[PDB]
Amino acid sequence: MSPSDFLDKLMGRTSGYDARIRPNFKGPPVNVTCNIFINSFGSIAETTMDYRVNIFLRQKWNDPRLAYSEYPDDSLDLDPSMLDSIWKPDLFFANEKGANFHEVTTDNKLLRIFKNGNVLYSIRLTLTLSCPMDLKNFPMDVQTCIMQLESFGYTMNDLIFEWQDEAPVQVAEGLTLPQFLLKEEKDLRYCTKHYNTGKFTCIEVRFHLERQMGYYLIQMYIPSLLIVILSWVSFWINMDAAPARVALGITTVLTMTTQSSGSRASLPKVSYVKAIDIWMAVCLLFVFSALLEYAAVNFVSRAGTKVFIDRAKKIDTISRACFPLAFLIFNIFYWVIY
Amino acid sequence: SRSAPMSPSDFLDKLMGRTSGYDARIRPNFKGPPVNVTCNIFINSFGSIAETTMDYRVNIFLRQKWNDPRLAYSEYPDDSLDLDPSMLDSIWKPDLFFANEKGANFHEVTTDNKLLRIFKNGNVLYSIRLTLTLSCPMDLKNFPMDVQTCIMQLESFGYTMNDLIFEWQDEAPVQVAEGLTLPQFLLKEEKDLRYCTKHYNTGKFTCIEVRFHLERQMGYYLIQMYIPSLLIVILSWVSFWINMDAAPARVALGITTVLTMTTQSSGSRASLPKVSYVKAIDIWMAVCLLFVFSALLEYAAVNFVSRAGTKVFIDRAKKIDTISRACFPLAFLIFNIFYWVIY
Amino acid sequence: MSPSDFLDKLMGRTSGYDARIRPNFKGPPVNVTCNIFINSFGSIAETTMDYRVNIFLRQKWNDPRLAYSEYPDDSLDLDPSMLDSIWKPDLFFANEKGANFHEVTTDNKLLRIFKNGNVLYSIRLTLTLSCPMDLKNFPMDVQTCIMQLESFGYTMNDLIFEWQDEAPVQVAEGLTLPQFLLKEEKDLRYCTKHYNTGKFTCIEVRFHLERQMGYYLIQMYIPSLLIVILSWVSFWINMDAAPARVALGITTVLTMTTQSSGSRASLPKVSYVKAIDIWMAVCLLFVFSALLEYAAVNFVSRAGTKVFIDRAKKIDTISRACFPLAFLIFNIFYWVIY
Amino acid sequence: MSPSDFLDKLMGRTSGYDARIRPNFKGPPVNVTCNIFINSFGSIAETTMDYRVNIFLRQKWNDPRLAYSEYPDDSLDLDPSMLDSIWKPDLFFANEKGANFHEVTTDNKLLRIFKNGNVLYSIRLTLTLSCPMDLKNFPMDVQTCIMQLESFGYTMNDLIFEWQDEAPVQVAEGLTLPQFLLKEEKDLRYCTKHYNTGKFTCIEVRFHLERQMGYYLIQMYIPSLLIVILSWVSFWINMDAAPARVALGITTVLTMTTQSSGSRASLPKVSYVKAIDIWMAVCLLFVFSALLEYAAVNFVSRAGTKVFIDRAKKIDTISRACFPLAFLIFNIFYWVIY
Amino acid sequence: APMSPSDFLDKLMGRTSGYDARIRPNFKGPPVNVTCNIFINSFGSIAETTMDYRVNIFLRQKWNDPRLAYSEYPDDSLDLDPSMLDSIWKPDLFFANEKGANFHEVTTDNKLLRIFKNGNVLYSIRLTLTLSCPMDLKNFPMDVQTCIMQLESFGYTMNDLIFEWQDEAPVQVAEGLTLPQFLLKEEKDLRYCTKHYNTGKFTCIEVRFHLERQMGYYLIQMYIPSLLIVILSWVSFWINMDAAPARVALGITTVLTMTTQSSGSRASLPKVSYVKAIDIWMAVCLLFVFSALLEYAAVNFVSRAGTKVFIDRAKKIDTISRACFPLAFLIFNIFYWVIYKIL
Ligand SMILES: C[C@H]1[C@H]2C(=O)N(C)c3ccncc3[C@H]2CN1S(=O)(=O)c1ccc2c(c1)OCO2
Ligand SMILES: C[C@H]1[C@H]2C(=O)N(C)c3ccncc3[C@H]2CN1S(=O)(=O)c1ccc2c(c1)OCO2
Ligand SMILES: C[C@H]1[C@H]2C(=O)N(C)c3ccncc3[C@H]2CN1S(=O)(=O)c1ccc2c(c1)OCO2
Ligand SMILES: C[C@H]1[C@H]2C(=O)N(C)c3ccncc3[C@H]2CN1S(=O)(=O)c1ccc2c(c1)OCO2
Ligand SMILES: C[C@H]1[C@H]2C(=O)N(C)c3ccncc3[C@H]2CN1S(=O)(=O)c1ccc2c(c1)OCO2
Ligand SMILES: *[C@@H]1O[C@H](CO)[C@@H](O)[C@H](O)[C@H]1NC(C)=O
Ligand SMILES: [Zn+2]
Ligand SMILES: [Zn+2]
Ligand SMILES: [Zn+2]
C-alpha cells in the first residue's frame, strides 16, 4: 500500500479519524508516559527567581485507532505535519513563565507510530520556569528547582501522566553550569492539582542545585578578610599620629559598608538575614571596634603624663593579640556552622 | 430496544458545526436581555512588581461562565461534556479584555492552554491561561513602610451594558495558589471586588474590578538602608571623644561621614521612579544628614572658640564636646521615637 | 430578516460588496473623522527620545454600501470578524517607533454601522511614538510630544482625515505621570505630507508635557547647595591646619565633579549646554574658589610674622561674608531667569 | 469595466497570471529602480556597532502582464491585498541585523500600476543595520554607515537593482540626531556579490555621520582640565604641609584614573588606542608628575638646613611656571593634530 | 514549443504531479545524503556572561530527489520561486546548540530554491542563530575560545537521513568581517557529532570556530592602570617618615583603589568559581601595594622613641624598599608574562 493512501486511511480524509476524541474515549483514562532530555540548563536568576531550560519532551501513549497491519515494520517514522491530524495530550508546564517551540529550519518535532497503535511524540521546547529560592544560607545555599507537567483540560478520569520507569530525565553529556552543580539525583513526584474546575493530572521533577563557593571567596570573603587585616595595622602605628590611625579606621569602615551593600547587589530584596549578611555584619564590628579602640587610646592619653601614655599603650599590646585571635575564633564558628 | 448513542463527531456537527446552523456572530438571547458572564480567576503566580515602571505581572486562569441556549443538549446523560478547545472558535464567547493591561499573552505550549466545558442546559465554562502585565499606580509617600493597592479590570470592548454584563462569582471569585510568596511584599488575604462600569463616547460598557492589597516588607530596608545609616550617624559621634588639637582627624571624620550620607541618600531612591514629592525614606536620610552635618559644625565651633591657647577658651571649647557627647545620641533617640511611632 | 442572512446580503457572499473599493469610489474623497481616548500615557524617555501610549482609536466614515433598512434600529453593533469583510481606512502613525494591537482575550475591536451607512470603528492600540526633545532648560523644561495620523496608500483625492469637532482627544480620569504634568490644552493641526509618491492626508495632535521640578531639588539642587555650604566651613577653621582645610577643599571639588557628571547620567549625550550644566559649573567654581582661597591664605602667611598672619586673616573674614553673599546673588539671577 | 472584474482579468482567477514567473521571463533581467525615504534615523550604538532606521522602500519595475487599456487613468492605486497576487522582487538588506514590517492599523504598503505595466511598490520598514566603526579618533571621529539592497534568489541575468537617478535617498525635513550630524552627501555604489550559489545584484548607500564634539567638552575634556589645574595648586602650598600636598596629589591621580576608565564605559572593548585615551594618559602624567614633584621637594628638604629648604624652594617656583606652560604646549599639539 | 512554467510545476510537484512531500527521496532505499555548507554573513555578540554568540548565515543544503528530475528544458538547472519549497520534501535540519534562531522575511522570505536536470536540489536559507559556546576563562584575558555549531536531524534516523559537509569550501566567511574583541582564526575544524538518544541514532555534523581574544583593551583598561597604582605605592618610600598621615593615606588609598580595581575586572564576566589569570595579577598587585603600607607600619613602629639608633634603623628599611619592591615587581612580571605568552 502506498504511503499516501495509507495515511489517508489511518488519519486522513477516508479514515474517519477525529482528533477531537481521545483514545478509549468511553473507557478509562489515557496513560501518557513522559520523559525529558535536557539539552541545556542555565540562566538561573536569583533576582527574577527562575531558570531556563532547553529540552526534548517525549510523550508516549496508545491510540488503538492508529494501529496498523499493512507493513511488517515494528514502527513508522511519520512526517510531523501529521501531528495536526491526530489526537494528542494537552501537556503544559504549570510553573512556566515563558516557553517556545523551535521552527528552524523546520518544526523540531518527531512522530513515530507502532503496529499496536502506540505513539511516540518528541518536541523540542525552551522553557523558563519559576524556581522560588530560599537564600538563608547564601552563598553556601542549595536550591531545589522544579518542573511540573500538567493537563489543562483533561480531568484525571480522561487523562493521566506518569514518568518513565527507566531513565525519565536524561541530561546531555558534559553539561555544566558556571555557578552551580547539578546533582545527579532528581526527585520525581505527583503534583496532582485540584481546582474549582476539577482534579487534573500533574507530575513533577525536582532538580537540586548546589551553589559553587569559589567565586564568593575571590569576590566577597577574601577581599573582606583583607579589610579586617588592614584595620589591625592601626595598632602597630604610633598613638600620636591621630589623622593616620583615624583615616585608617574610617576608610576601612566605609569600604566595609559598600562591601556589605555590594554583596546583595545581584539578589532580590528579600527581607530576611542571609549568611553573607552575618559575615559582613561581624566584619563590620571587627573593623568598627578597631576605630573605637583608638577612640579609647586617644581619650585616656589626653594629658601627656607617663601613667596614662603607658595605660593607653597597654590597650594596643592587648588589641594586637586579641582581635586576630577573636576573629580566628569567629571563623572557626562561622565556617563549621555552614 | 436500547440503541447506540450518537457519535461525538456527529453530535458536534449538529450542535455548533456544519449542519448546526449555529452562528457565533450572534450572542445568546440576542433579541433579549444581556448575557450574564460570571467571572472568577485563579492566580497561578504574582510578581514582577516594579516601582519604576509602576506595574506588576500575573499568571492566571481566567474562568468565564455564561448560558447559551443553543448549546443545550439531550443526547447524552452526562451533566456536562469536556470539549476539545478547537471548538471554542465555533462558538460565541464574551470579548473580555483587561482595561489596565500594559501587555498580555496566551499560552500555546504544548497546546493552547484552554478549557471548554458545556452543560446539558447550555451553560458554558471557559477557562484560559493568561499572563498579564497590569498597571498599578503607586503612592510612595510612606516608602518603604508603604502599602499599595494594585487593581485588575475585566471589561467588554464591544458589547454595551444592554447586550453583555460581567459579574464576579459569589463563592470564591479570586483564588490564589497555595504557598505563593512575594519576596518584597505580603499579599493580603482580603481582595476588594467592585464595579468599574465605563462610560465612553462609544457607550456604556460593563467592567468589574478586583483590588489586591500589597504591604511592603520592612526587613530589607533595615539591612540595606536604616542600619547602615545609624552606623554612619554613630560614627560621626566618635569625633567628640577625639582630642580637639587633632584637626585633620576630626575634620576628615566629619567630612567622610557627610559624603557617605549623601551617596547613601541618593542611593536610596535609585530603584524608584523620579516622583517629585517627599518620601518617608527622604525624611530619614535628611534628618540623618543634619545629625552628621551638625557634628562637623560642632567642631567648627570647637576649633574657632579655641583659637588662642588660653585656659579660659580651651575649657570653653571643652564644654561643648562634653555636652555634645550626651546631647546628640539623646536628640537622635528622641527623633527615632517620633519617626517610627509616626509610621 | 435573520442576522445571518442580513450580513450575507450586506457584505457577505450574496452581497457583491468588494472591500478593495473605497466608498464613493469614482466620486470625492472619503472623509474619515478621528478621535482618540487615551487609556494610558507614560514611558517618557529622554535617552531614546520617545514615549508610550495606550489608546482607543475611533474612526468614523460613510459607506453607502452598508446602509440598511431591514431593522428599525438606528445602529447595529456587529461582531468584529466582519471588519475583514468591509473597506476601511489605512491609517498609520507616521511617528510610531513601535505599535501593536490587543488580542486578549479577543481582538479589542469595535464595529458599529448605522442606517445611513455610517461606520464607527474603534480599535485599541499601544503605540511608542518619537518625541524629539529640547533639553536647553532641563530640568525646568517643557516638551511637546506629537502624534501623526496618516494614510499610507490613499492620496488626498481619495481619502482625507479630520479631527472630531467635539472632544477629539479624551484622557482617562485620574491619569497621572510621575515626572510630568500633562497640560489640558492639546493642539490639533494638519501635517499633510508631500512625498515623491504623492500628497497624503495627515492630522496631528500635540501634547504639552511640563516637567515637575520637585525630584531635582531632592536629588540634584539641594545636595549641591549642601556641598557648597560645606566648602564654606573651611573659613571658620584655623589657618595652621593645612591638611584639614585642603582635604575639605579637595573632597568638596571631587564630590562636585561626580555630582556634575551624575546629573547627565539619565539623558542623551546632547552637545549643548543645559540649565543643570550651568548650575553644576557655577557650583564647581564656588567650591573650587574656596580651595584657591586657602592657597592664597597659605601662601601669603609663609613667614610667621604678625603682618602676614593678619593679612591672611583678613582674607577669611572677607570670604566668610563674600561667598555666601555672592552665591545668594547668583541664585537670585539663576532662578529668576528660569 | 467594474473594478472587481478588471482585477480578476489582470491578476485574479480568470487572468492566468502566475506570480511565480518574473516579467520578461525568457528575456533579459528585470530592472528594479530603488529609492528610499528616511522617516527616522537613530539608535546609533558604538557598543553593538549598528544603527536603526525607519524607511519607505520604493521599488519600481515593469511587468508587461499588468499593462491596461480599460481606463484612461495614467495609473491606478490598488489595494495592497493585491500585492500577494503579483510577482515582485525579493529585495533584502544584506547587512540587516533585524527588520520588521508595519501592520498598524493596516499593512503599511502601497501598490500603484501604470497603463504600460510599470509598478510602484512602497513598503514601510524598520531596519537595524550593522555599521562597523573605526574609533581611532573618538570622540572627534566620523563614521560611514552603509545599507545594502540585494536579491536573495535572483542571479544577475534575471534581476538587477539600480538607484533612481533623481533623488534616490530622501530624508524627512528637520530630522536630527543628538550625537551626530548626518551629512547631506550620500555615496551610492554597487556591492555586487559573488557566492558559491552565483552572482547576485546588490546596490549600496553610504551615510556619513560626523560626531558632535560638544558633549565631550562638557563631560570629559573640561572636567579633566579642572583636575589638572587642581594638581597645580599644590605648588602654592607650603612644603611643610606633607599630608595636604600628598592628599591633593593622590586624590587628583585617583580621580584621573576613574575619569580615564569612565571615558571608555559606553564603547566596545576595542584593542587599540583612541584619541580620548591619549588625552587621559597625558592628563594622567601631568597629575602624576605633580605628586612626584613633591616627592622630590620632600626628599631634598630632609635636613632643615637653609641650603636645602631653598633648593627645594627652587623646584616649586619653576614648577608653577613649567607645568601650565608644558600643558599649554601639549594642547597646541593635540587639538591641532585632530 | 516548450511547456509553460505553470504547467511544468503542476506536473513536477503540484496538483497533477502526485508528488508527496511527506515521503523522502529513495524512501524504501538508502539514506538521503544532504551536503551542507554555510556562508557567514556576520559573526558577533560574543558574550562571556551568557556564554553564547550570534551569527548570521546562509545555510546551503544539497540533496537528490529523483522525483524532481526534468527533461522538458535544456537548462542545467532551474531557479524556482521559493513558494515551491512548501510543495517539496526537504531535510529537517536544526541547530543542536541553538539558544535562539529566526528566519528572515523582509522584504520577502530570504530563501533560494534551485533544481537540476537530474533532480538535485540546492536550498539556501538565511538564518540568524544564537549559539551556546561554553567558555574556559582560566587564562582570561589571554584566553582562546572554541565556539561550535551543530547541524542535526530532529526526526530522521541515520538509516533515512545523513548529513555531511562539502568537500570544497564548506564554511565561507564574508570578506573584511572583523570582531572587535577577538580574531577569528582561518582554520575551522569539521567533525561528526552523531547523537544517540533513547529515540534513536541521529545524524549530526559540527564546525568549530577558534576565537583568540585580543589583549590590547586589557592593557589600556586593566594592566596599565594597575601598574600605575603599584608605582604610586612606591612614592611613599621617598616621603619623610615623620609624615604619618601622608604615608598612611597614600598607603590606604592605593589599597582601596586596588580592591575596586580587582572587583571591577570581573564585572563583565560570569561568576565562575575558579581563579583566572587576571585574578592572579590583581592579587599579586594587591600584595605589592598592601606590603607598602605594612612597610610603613614597620618604619613607624621601630622609630617610636626618637633615639638616633632607631631613626637610622627605620631609615635602613626605606632605602632597601626603594630598590627591593620595583625589583621584586619586575621579577614578577618576567614570570607572569612569560608563563602566559610562552604558553
Ligand atoms: C468525545 C470527547 C468529548 C466530546 O466532544 N463529546 C461530544 C462527548 C460526548 C459524550 N461524552 C463525552 C464527550 C467529550 C469527552 N470526549 S473525550 O474524552 O475524548 C475528550 C476530548 C477532548 C477533551 C476532553 C475530553 O477534555 C479536554 O478536551
Ligand atoms: C446579531 C448581532 C448584530 C448583527 O450582526 N445584526 C445583523 C443585528 C441585526 C439586528 N439587530 C441587532 C444586530 C446586532 C446585535 N446582535 S448581537 O447582540 O448578537 C451582537 C453581536 C456581536 C457584537 C455585539 C452584539 O456587540 C459587540 O459585538
Ligand atoms: C477601485 C479602486 C482601485 C482599484 O483597485 N481599481 C482596479 C481601479 C479601477 C479603476 N479605477 C480606479 C481603480 C482604483 C481606485 N479605486 S479606489 O479609489 O476605491 C482605491 C482602492 C484602494 C486604494 C486606493 C484607492 O488607494 C490605495 O488603496
Ligand atoms: C519560470 C521561472 C522559473 C520556473 O519556475 N520554471 C518552471 C522555469 C522553466 C524554464 N526555464 C526557467 C524557469 C525558471 C526561471 N523563471 S523566472 O526567471 O521567472 C524566475 C522566477 C523565480 C525565481 C527565479 C527566476 O530565480 C529566483 O526565483
Ligand atoms: C513514507 C515515510 C513514512 C510514512 O508516512 N509511511 C506511511 C510509511 C509507510 C511505510 N514505511 C515507512 C513509512 C514512513 C517512512 N517514510 S520516509 O522514510 O519517507 C520518512 C518521511 C518523513 C519522516 C521520516 C521518514 O522520519 C521522520 O520524518
Ligand atoms: C500507566 O502505565 C504504567 C506502565 O506503562 C503502569 O505501571 C501504570 O499502572 C499505568 N497507570 C494507569 C492509571 O493505567
Ligand atoms: Zn534529593
Ligand atoms: Zn481591603
Ligand atoms: Zn498650545
Ligand SMILES: [Zn+2]
Ligand atoms: Zn563620501
Ligand SMILES: [Zn+2]
Ligand atoms: Zn583548529
